[PDB]
Scaffold this active site. Sequence first.
Site, PDB file in Angstrom:
ATOM      1  N   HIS A  24      20.587 -19.407  42.274  1.00  0.00           N
ATOM      2  CA  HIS A  24      21.357 -18.566  43.159  1.00  0.00           C
ATOM      3  C   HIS A  24      20.544 -18.365  44.418  1.00  0.00           C
ATOM      4  O   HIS A  24      19.397 -18.809  44.521  1.00  0.00           O
ATOM      5  CB  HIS A  24      21.653 -17.205  42.505  1.00  0.00           C
TER       6      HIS A  24
ATOM      7  N   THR B  19      16.250  -8.299  40.847  1.00  0.00           N
ATOM      8  CA  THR B  19      17.411  -7.427  40.644  1.00  0.00           C
ATOM      9  C   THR B  19      17.195  -6.683  39.344  1.00  0.00           C
ATOM     10  O   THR B  19      16.476  -7.138  38.468  1.00  0.00           O
ATOM     11  CB  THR B  19      18.722  -8.227  40.519  1.00  0.00           C
TER      12      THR B  19
ATOM     13  N   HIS C 286      16.604 -19.299  44.537  1.00  0.00           N
ATOM     14  CA  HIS C 286      15.885 -19.075  43.291  1.00  0.00           C
ATOM     15  C   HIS C 286      16.410 -19.984  42.208  1.00  0.00           C
ATOM     16  O   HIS C 286      17.565 -19.845  41.796  1.00  0.00           O
ATOM     17  CB  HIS C 286      16.043 -17.613  42.888  1.00  0.00           C
TER      18      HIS C 286
HETATM   19  N1  LIG Z   1      16.358 -12.873  41.653  1.00  0.00           N
HETATM   20  S1  LIG Z   1      15.619 -13.452  40.392  1.00  0.00           S
HETATM   21  O1  LIG Z   1      14.467 -12.664  40.107  1.00  0.00           O
HETATM   22  O2  LIG Z   1      15.389 -14.837  40.479  1.00  0.00           O
HETATM   23  C1  LIG Z   1      16.679 -13.275  39.050  1.00  0.00           C
HETATM   24  C2  LIG Z   1      16.650 -14.215  38.006  1.00  0.00           C
HETATM   25  C3  LIG Z   1      17.475 -14.131  36.909  1.00  0.00           C
HETATM   26  C4  LIG Z   1      18.409 -13.153  36.807  1.00  0.00           C
HETATM   27  C5  LIG Z   1      19.348 -13.171  35.650  1.00  0.00           C
HETATM   28  O3  LIG Z   1      19.889 -14.292  35.467  1.00  0.00           O
HETATM   29  N2  LIG Z   1      19.640 -12.052  34.973  1.00  0.00           N
HETATM   30  C6  LIG Z   1      18.909 -10.849  35.029  1.00  0.00           C
HETATM   31  C7  LIG Z   1      18.239 -10.535  33.722  1.00  0.00           C
HETATM   32  C8  LIG Z   1      19.124 -10.753  32.574  1.00  0.00           C
HETATM   33  C9  LIG Z   1      18.772 -10.186  31.344  1.00  0.00           C
HETATM   34  C10 LIG Z   1      19.619 -10.411  30.253  1.00  0.00           C
HETATM   35  O4  LIG Z   1      19.212  -9.817  29.062  1.00  0.00           O
HETATM   36  C11 LIG Z   1      20.785 -11.189  30.409  1.00  0.00           C
HETATM   37  O5  LIG Z   1      21.618 -11.409  29.315  1.00  0.00           O
HETATM   38  C12 LIG Z   1      21.131 -11.742  31.635  1.00  0.00           C
HETATM   39  C13 LIG Z   1      20.286 -11.510  32.713  1.00  0.00           C
HETATM   40  C14 LIG Z   1      20.720 -12.116  33.985  1.00  0.00           C
HETATM   41  C15 LIG Z   1      18.489 -12.188  37.812  1.00  0.00           C
HETATM   42  C16 LIG Z   1      17.621 -12.263  38.911  1.00  0.00           C
HETATM   43 ZN   LIG Z   2      16.993 -14.199  42.974  1.00  0.00          ZN
END
Ligand SMILES: NS(=O)(=O)c1ccc(C(=O)N2CCc3cc(O)c(O)cc3C2)cc1
Ligand SMILES: [Zn+2]
Length: 257
Positions: A91, A196, A116
């Site tokens: 994303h 996030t 990312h």
């Molecule tokens: N901006 S960043 O740091 O690259 C980033 C990377 C990955 C995510 C992400 O896919 N999420 C958050 C944590 C989470 C936790 C869970 O348990 C789940 O099911 C789903 C998720 C979904 C959000 C942000």
């Molecule tokens: Zn991100």
Amino acid sequence: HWGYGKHNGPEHWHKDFPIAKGERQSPVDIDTHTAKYDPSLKPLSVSYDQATSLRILNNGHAFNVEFDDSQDKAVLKGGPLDGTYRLIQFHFHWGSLDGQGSEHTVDKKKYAAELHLVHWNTKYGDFGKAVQQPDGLAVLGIFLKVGSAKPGLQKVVDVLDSIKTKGKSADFTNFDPRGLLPESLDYWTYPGSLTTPPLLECVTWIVLKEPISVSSEQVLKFRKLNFNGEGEPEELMVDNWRPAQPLKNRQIKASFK
Ligand SMILES: NS(=O)(=O)c1ccc(C(=O)N2CCc3cc(O)c(O)cc3C2)cc1
Ligand SMILES: [Zn+2]
């Protein structure tokens, strides 16, 4: 719930997610003069030849291009990493104007956007287990500047019309993420967090030095997306970035001289 507005943006997140004020939060400013060259760092291994994209989703904060991570297909290894990390989604974060949008900054410079590519450590078996571990994720971050078009981005740009609003998805097969990479894999690395909520401190950050160029028209199309659901008041999906957080007791390491 949390978002990027005046009333629910980054400065509010700590109320629901107290780790927001933690010891290894992301993003950070990368002070290029203070980052130490680490000759023990390996070249990054980005093995995306067998990547299987499936779908693109507007989740109300960004859009995610999702991958089949049920086998070792698209993997990240080497660099600062121990073991094998599987690509699950990518994303972007971007601004309302070209002068802001990136999450990491480089000597306080903000880029127009930041990509990312999110990977999880296969030793933990699934993504949900991985995010509970300090070495659970490896996020490859790539800066976007506005200039020449990125041809490998256009397929993403053109599908955005079909996922304008929160909760919309579209089939998105056969997308090759290799087309989003810059020439050089020189990088900075540091231990950090999701940027996030839930802000979990589970990420090895790998931020490429070389930005990719995208066109003004490409980024303008990102800015036509909506945070809101269909039939709700239109709120343009812009400025979906968290500002730089305190570095605290951390060192940023450079792979290059
Ligand atoms: N901006 S960043 O740091 O690259 C980033 C990377 C990955 C995510 C992400 O896919 N999420 C958050 C944590 C989470 C936790 C869970 O348990 C789940 O099911 C789903 C998720 C979904 C959000 C942000
Ligand atoms: Zn991100």
